[PDB]
Amino acid sequence: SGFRKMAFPSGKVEGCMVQVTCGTTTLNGLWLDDVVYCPRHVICTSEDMLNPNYEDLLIRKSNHNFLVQAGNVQLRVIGHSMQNCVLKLKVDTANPKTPKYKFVRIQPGQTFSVLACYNGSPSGVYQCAMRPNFTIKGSFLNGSCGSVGFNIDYDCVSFCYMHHMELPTGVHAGTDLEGNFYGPFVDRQTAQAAGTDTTITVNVLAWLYAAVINGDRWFLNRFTTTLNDFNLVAMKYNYEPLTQDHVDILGPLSAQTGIAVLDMCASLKELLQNGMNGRTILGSALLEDEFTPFDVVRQCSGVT
Amino acid sequence: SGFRKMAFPSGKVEGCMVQVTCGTTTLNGLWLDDVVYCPRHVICTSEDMLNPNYEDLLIRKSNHNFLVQAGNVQLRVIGHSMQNCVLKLKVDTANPKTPKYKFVRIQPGQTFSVLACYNGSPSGVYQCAMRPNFTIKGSFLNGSCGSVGFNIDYDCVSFCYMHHMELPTGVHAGTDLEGNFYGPFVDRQTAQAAGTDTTITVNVLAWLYAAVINGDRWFLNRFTTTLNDFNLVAMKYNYEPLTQDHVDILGPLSAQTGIAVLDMCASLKELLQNGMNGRTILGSALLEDEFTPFDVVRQCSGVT
Numbered sequence: 001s002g003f004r005k006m007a008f009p010s011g012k013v014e015g016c017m018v019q020v021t022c023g024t025t026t027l028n029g030l031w032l033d034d035v036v037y038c039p040r041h042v043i044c045t046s047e048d049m050l051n052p053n054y055e056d057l058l059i060r061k062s063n064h065n066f067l068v069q070a071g072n073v074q075l076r077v078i079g080h081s082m083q084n085c086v087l088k089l090k091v092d093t094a095n096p097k098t099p100k101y102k103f104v105r106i107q108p109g110q111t112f113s114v115l116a117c118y119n120g121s122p123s124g125v126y127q128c129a130m131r132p133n134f135t136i137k138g139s140f141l142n143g144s145c146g147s148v149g150f151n152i153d154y155d156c157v158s159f160c161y162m163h164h165m166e167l168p169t170g171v172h173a174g175t176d177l178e179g180n181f182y183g184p185f186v187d188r189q190t191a192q193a194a195g196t197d198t199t200i201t202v203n204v205l206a207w208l209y210a211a212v213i214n215g216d217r218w219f220l221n222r223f224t225t226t227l228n229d230f231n232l233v234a235m236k237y238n239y240e241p242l243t244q245d246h247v248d249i250l251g252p253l254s255a256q257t258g259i260a261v262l263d264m265c266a267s268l269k270e271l272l273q274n275g276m277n278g279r280t281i282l283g284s285a286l287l288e289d290e291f292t293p294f295d296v297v298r299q300c301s302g303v304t
Numbered sequence: 305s306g307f308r309k310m311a312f313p314s315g316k317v318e319g320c321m322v323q324v325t326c327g328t329t330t331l332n333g334l335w336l337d338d339v340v341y342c343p344r345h346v347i348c349t350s351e352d353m354l355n356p357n358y359e360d361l362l363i364r365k366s367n368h369n370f371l372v373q374a375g376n377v378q379l380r381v382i383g384h385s386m387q388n389c390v391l392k393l394k395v396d397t398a399n400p401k402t403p404k405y406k407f408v409r410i411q412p413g414q415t416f417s418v419l420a421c422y423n424g425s426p427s428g429v430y431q432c433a434m435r436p437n438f439t440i441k442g443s444f445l446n447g448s449c450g451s452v453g454f455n456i457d458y459d460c461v462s463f464c465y466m467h468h469m470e471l472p473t474g475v476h477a478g479t480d481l482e483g484n485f486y487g488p489f490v491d492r493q494t495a496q497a498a499g500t501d502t503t504i505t506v507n508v509l510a511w512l513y514a515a516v517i518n519g520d521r522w523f524l525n526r527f528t529t530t531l532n533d534f535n536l537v538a539m540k541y542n543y544e545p546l547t548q549d550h551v552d553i554l555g556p557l558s559a560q561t562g563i564a565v566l567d568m569c570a571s572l573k574e575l576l577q578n579g580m581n582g583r584t585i586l587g588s589a590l591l592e593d594e595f596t597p598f599d600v601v602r603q604c605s606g607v608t
């Protein structure tokens with residue numbers, strides 16, 4: 001009973017967090033095996049950030065200029081290299097707390113947990129979605145760069161995000177663990193446009209299935225629709241178009257509840273066209289889109 | 305930038321989770337030093353739960369009947385005892401991952417993180433508030449009993465909650481770590497009334513301060529009010545009455561934003577009397593009450 005915006009247990013990621021200092025700049029790093037990963041803008045002063053030439057700035061740096069501290073012990077840097085927007089600092093000791101892990105590039109609409117860190121120390125954990133426009137609506141202050149996003153499958157941590165930027169619009173931008181930004185963002189303190197964001201339709205429907213499973217049924221109606229009819233309403237309300245792939249992923253939830261995916265689409269169409277009328281669904285007064293169909297099944301079945 | 309319902313990093317608590325089996329019943333336990341804490345209803349069959357005589361049921365049990373497994377290793381039980389609604393199973397080995405800890409009984413309106421577990425394994429972490437009526441609106445399935453709520457102050461974990469019950473209304477009930485239930489609940493599968501719940505006024509105001517800090521200012525008005533006038537509106541909308549103690553706790557937030565607490569009360573009064581008019585505050589379409597004044601300061605300053 002109950003449905004919550006749940007993050008993964010963060011323990012395996014906490015044991016990987018280190019502090020990285022270069023000159024006067026400090027941010028977070030991720031220590032896996034004998035490599036520490038961090039945003040390359042650790043080599044910049046706030047002055048350099050307006051238009052940085054990263055290749056030129058890194059050339060002024062040597063292994064001894066990167067101070068890596070794990071808790072209270074110092075790591076010895078024996079190599080440094082830039083890969084896209086991350087620096088990989090080779091250390092002489094493998095992290096004894098390195099969990100089984102993968103680096104993955106998530107798709108927009110997919111979710112992950114963020115372990116917000118400051119000075120190498122974890123402050124908190126929350127669940128995010130990578131927006132269709134490749135931004136994240138996180139909680140990041142100065143010094144949070146290097147904090148990572150991840151998913152956990154039994155004992156394997158798939159790292160998917162590293163925080164780099166707080167855009168002037170208040171949204172957050174970052175890279176995968178190979179240093180490639182999600183979206184058109186660059187690691188430069190300049191005005192950068194995030195595209196028009198849309199609501200993740202498959203996640204809203206998955207969340208409506210979670211509401212039915214937990215008792216919130218008031219929104220269910222006597223109507224059905226077609227993918228084409230629904231997509232006309234989706235277009236009007238800036239929802240991602242629903243595809244047969246999305247319908248297929250909702251299969252298990254449709255099977256467990258006995259509610260056809262297109263009947264749930266008609267309930268969503270009525271909610272979009274008429275609002276909530278002052279009511280709530282799972283304690284929320286808007287349509288939640290940060291739970292994937294996989295999150296709902298996992299939470300509703302109790303997968304550990 | 306950004307404000308999220310953030311949970312504490314759960315690592316220190318993950319290292320304390322064990323599985324406890326007694327007969328055919330399995331739930332979670334908390335291993336701290338050489339003691340494993342779990343709900344006493346682990347000794348019941350679902351049949352016993354309708355009207356259990358715990359003293360009589362425990363007498364049929366011996367140390368060898370309690371199977372405690374931490375990950376994959378077995379703990380040797382050398383003592384058992386019931387304290388209120390918890391069982392304390394003395395084990396022969398102190399948990400090497402026991403963090404610095406305290407047992408605390410939280411007040412209603414205060415918040416904490418829950419590490420939802422099944423069969424001794426962590427599945428997720430989320431932030432809760434202890435409702436004014438002493439229930440929690442969590443996410444708990446069968447097998448989640450023994451999962452704990454906690455707060456962390458630097459390196460000290462203060463355990464405040466242990467999950468015991470899923471009430472027929474879909475809300476959750478549990479105890480502190482001494483086994484005393486929060487509220488009038490008993491560990492019996494019977495119809496139990498949760499009192500009338502109220503909204504935690506001081507937390508809503510603290511959340512309104514968090515919205516001002518992050519840019520959401522539309523709700524601010526040209527009005528002020530008095531504690532007596534505000535409490536008349538609070539009464540009408542089932543909000544907890546605001547006291548000078550609550551105003552005092554909002555002091556630091558009032559100082560950082562330059563918005564007098566009673567001016568923020570008048571904005572809240574207007575939101576209560578007029579609704580949101582289809583707008584949002586911090587991505588929410590209702591008034592959030594699960595952030596204390598301490599949570600807001602901690603998140604907005606980046607305390608680790």
Ligand SMILES: *[C@@]1(O)C(=O)Nc2ccc(S(N)(=O)=O)cc21
Pocket residue numbers: 026027028049140141142143144145146164165166167188189
């Ligand atoms: C990031 O939060 C950090 O730790 N340091 C830093 C410096 C500059 C930016 S910004 N203004 O977004 O370019 C972000 C971070």
Ligand SMILES: *[C@@]1(O)C(=O)Nc2ccc(S(N)(=O)=O)cc21
Pocket residue numbers: 330331332353444445446447448449450468469470471492493
């Ligand atoms: C609790 O979730 C658990 O793990 N086992 C158990 C048994 C009975 C209840 S109930 N129906 O709430 O009394 C809760 C739990």
